[PDB]
Write an enzyme that holds these catalytic residues in place. Sequence first.
Site, PDB file in Angstrom:
ATOM      1  N   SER A  61      -6.156 -19.226 -26.931  1.00  0.00           N
ATOM      2  CA  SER A  61      -6.464 -19.776 -25.683  1.00  0.00           C
ATOM      3  C   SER A  61      -8.095 -18.750 -25.733  1.00  0.00           C
ATOM      4  CB  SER A  61      -5.615 -19.088 -24.455  1.00  0.00           C
ATOM      5  OG  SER A  61      -6.111 -18.067 -24.749  1.00  0.00           O
ATOM      6  N   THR A  77      -4.334 -17.387 -16.115  1.00  0.00           N
ATOM      7  CA  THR A  77      -3.501 -17.650 -15.396  1.00  0.00           C
ATOM      8  C   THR A  77      -2.428 -16.133 -14.796  1.00  0.00           C
ATOM      9  OG1 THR A  77      -1.398 -17.872 -16.840  1.00  0.00           O
ATOM     10  CG2 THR A  77      -2.776 -19.462 -16.745  1.00  0.00           C
ATOM     11  N   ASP A 124       7.862  -9.480 -21.061  1.00  0.00           N
ATOM     12  CA  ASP A 124       7.993  -8.350 -21.503  1.00  0.00           C
ATOM     13  C   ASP A 124       8.933  -7.781 -20.404  1.00  0.00           C
ATOM     14  OD1 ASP A 124       7.781  -5.904 -22.050  1.00  0.00           O
ATOM     15  OD2 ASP A 124       5.787  -5.249 -21.066  1.00  0.00           O
ATOM     16  N   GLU A 183      10.194  -8.075 -26.813  1.00  0.00           N
ATOM     17  CA  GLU A 183      10.106  -8.656 -27.736  1.00  0.00           C
ATOM     18  C   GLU A 183      10.862  -8.320 -29.437  1.00  0.00           C
ATOM     19  OE1 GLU A 183       6.258 -10.485 -27.410  1.00  0.00           O
ATOM     20  OE2 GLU A 183       5.062  -8.695 -27.086  1.00  0.00           O
ATOM     21  N   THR A 231       4.055  -2.979 -29.621  1.00  0.00           N
ATOM     22  CA  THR A 231       3.273  -2.290 -28.757  1.00  0.00           C
ATOM     23  C   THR A 231       3.284  -1.497 -27.384  1.00  0.00           C
ATOM     24  OG1 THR A 231       1.945  -4.602 -29.692  1.00  0.00           O
ATOM     25  CG2 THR A 231       1.272  -4.193 -27.528  1.00  0.00           C
ATOM     26  N   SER A 232       4.347  -1.782 -26.903  1.00  0.00           N
ATOM     27  CA  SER A 232       4.151  -0.892 -25.623  1.00  0.00           C
ATOM     28  C   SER A 232       5.964  -1.055 -25.962  1.00  0.00           C
ATOM     29  CB  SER A 232       4.532  -1.888 -24.952  1.00  0.00           C
ATOM     30  OG  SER A 232       3.580  -3.278 -24.493  1.00  0.00           O
ATOM     31  N   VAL A 246      -3.489   4.112 -18.400  1.00  0.00           N
ATOM     32  CA  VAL A 246      -4.478   3.532 -17.798  1.00  0.00           C
ATOM     33  C   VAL A 246      -3.639   3.550 -17.354  1.00  0.00           C
ATOM     34  CG1 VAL A 246      -6.652   3.255 -18.020  1.00  0.00           C
ATOM     35  CG2 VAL A 246      -5.365   3.221 -20.165  1.00  0.00           C
ATOM     36  N   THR A 300      -5.922  -7.197 -22.908  1.00  0.00           N
ATOM     37  CA  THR A 300      -5.026  -6.683 -24.191  1.00  0.00           C
ATOM     38  C   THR A 300      -4.337  -6.969 -25.156  1.00  0.00           C
ATOM     39  OG1 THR A 300      -3.837  -5.094 -23.497  1.00  0.00           O
ATOM     40  CG2 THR A 300      -4.967  -5.946 -21.138  1.00  0.00           C
ATOM     41  N   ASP A 348      -3.804  -9.791 -25.748  1.00  0.00           N
ATOM     42  CA  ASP A 348      -4.674 -10.359 -27.798  1.00  0.00           C
ATOM     43  C   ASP A 348      -5.679  -9.561 -28.300  1.00  0.00           C
ATOM     44  OD1 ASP A 348      -3.271 -12.734 -26.015  1.00  0.00           O
ATOM     45  OD2 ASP A 348      -5.072 -12.648 -24.660  1.00  0.00           O
TER      46      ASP A 348
END
Lengths: 323, 323
Positions: free
Chosen positions: A23, A58, A129, A164, A197-198, A237, A244, A246
């Site tokens: 996007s 968004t 998530d 995911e 990633t998390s 943080v 972030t 992306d």
Amino acid sequence: HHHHHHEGVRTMEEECRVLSIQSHVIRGYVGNRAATFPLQVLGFEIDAVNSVQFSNHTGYAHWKGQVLNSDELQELYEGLRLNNMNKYDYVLTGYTRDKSFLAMVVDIVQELKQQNPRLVYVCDPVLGDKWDGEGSMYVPEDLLPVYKEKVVPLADIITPNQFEAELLSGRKIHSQEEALRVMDMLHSMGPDTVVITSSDLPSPQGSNYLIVLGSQRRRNPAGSVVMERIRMDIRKVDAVFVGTGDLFAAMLLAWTHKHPNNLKVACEKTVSTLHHVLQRTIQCAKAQAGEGVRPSPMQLELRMVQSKRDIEDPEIVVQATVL
Amino acid sequence: HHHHHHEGVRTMEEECRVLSIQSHVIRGYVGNRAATFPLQVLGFEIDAVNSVQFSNHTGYAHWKGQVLNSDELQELYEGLRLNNMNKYDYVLTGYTRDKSFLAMVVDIVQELKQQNPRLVYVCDPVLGDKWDGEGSMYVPEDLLPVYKEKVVPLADIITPNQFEAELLSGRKIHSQEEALRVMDMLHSMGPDTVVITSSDLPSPQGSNYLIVLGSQRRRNPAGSVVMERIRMDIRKVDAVFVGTGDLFAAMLLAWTHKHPNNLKVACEKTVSTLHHVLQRTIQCAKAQAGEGVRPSPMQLELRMVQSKRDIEDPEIVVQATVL
């Protein structure tokens, strides 16, 4: 004789074509906005194909724009095929709401990979998530059935996050000894480099001090396969950031491309780079709105330009452990 | 205090925002793809509305894509307002081929100025050029009345190639000095800073050198139009380059900002930049194609990324001459 080194200036280096179909917004930095500058300031010949073009993201209360459709990205892609500019080194993918645009993206990733068996499709599943503990998807209820069999099977790299990561395997993670298991479960689908990633899995340093873990196989050796793994933790943080996601896969592309098959330093220059951003991001969020309360999206947007200095080469702010 | 200076890692360096409404392409660099990068590397926060998303520039046998439009442009702006974030500093425009669209630019640049006391619309009157002798236009009739009666009146930094000036006034350019008479009608109506980036006025010298006539006209203490006149020689180049005017305005705007009423290093830093970039887009073009063969439509794509540093510090290879 440091004098023949300068006529090198005249040479044809590598053109690392990065087709990044994400996007684009007008104000702010999410998706392709977020993926380009860094990848550019890092020498990548990246091409942006808008999925949308919203005034902003968004994450604000309002937004207006258009959403490129499958039929459109189809014309969009042929134009290339015509003047024969349809051959990339890396195809980069991300957040996508509509299903038909996802099959199309595939086809393009697919043909590009039949026009080039060497392509590296860095793929980051738009699944969803968890915010208040419970986890929800952030897209139509039948995008997975697509991400499962036609996207992930095609991808060479994925950056799931816990929620995911789990969905691209069918099992689920309760411990550190399962986010490596489920990671084993994803290569069977195809991705040969898997990172989560998390998550929520605790670490020797607190919940605040969140994690990152990943695996990368390669059955390229004469005989069988080899497989290396790493993991790392990073203070949280606190502040809320959007874009972030992306940026991660982008920098996890650059550094990856640029270095040998070792997620360690690769992942370190990467997950680090997010730091030399966010810091300089949270810092200003408070630089203006009432010296007495928590910021807003606009008062929180990724200070990306300003990070050029850092982007070109980060000062490693976090270390990783080998497995 | 060489340590209280490194502190200033907290100092807020304001948004020298920008709102470039030009074209976008999925390959190649022209419009916002040639305009964007650089200003971003210079701490400028360019935001790119993308009047068009084509696969590539219009010099290729083919090119497909989708064009933005009146209301489609109108909505992007409407969103940007719902979050009450329309506050800007500059507006960078260029090759537009729809009056209905352009009038949207100008209508948009309106609320943008009634909002800001010191905006700086920098418009590139893309209208036409010259083949081998005579002149001519590549934009529909519809548009000339509008830049005359609409756009230029709000512009502030225009960059008409010689023709567009002549075509903007219907006042052919005789002696370079006449160019300085047309310019002031131009100045007279808006642009307190005209830059005839391109022209044909014989440099007393050579017969392959761009003559560029600059003019920043504003005031000192009382109502006195101090004028700044200039010219400087330009060794020309060896090919059909693209995005140069866009790259030129993109940066004229750039430098004209750290050196306001010092137009001298403005048309100064800018120019050596098309230089370095072109001679390099061509320096290698020397090898990217055939040993004695001409650059193609794609090999001639400006090389913006591989000029990253050049952009930060342009060794000024061309010294200005006042008049």
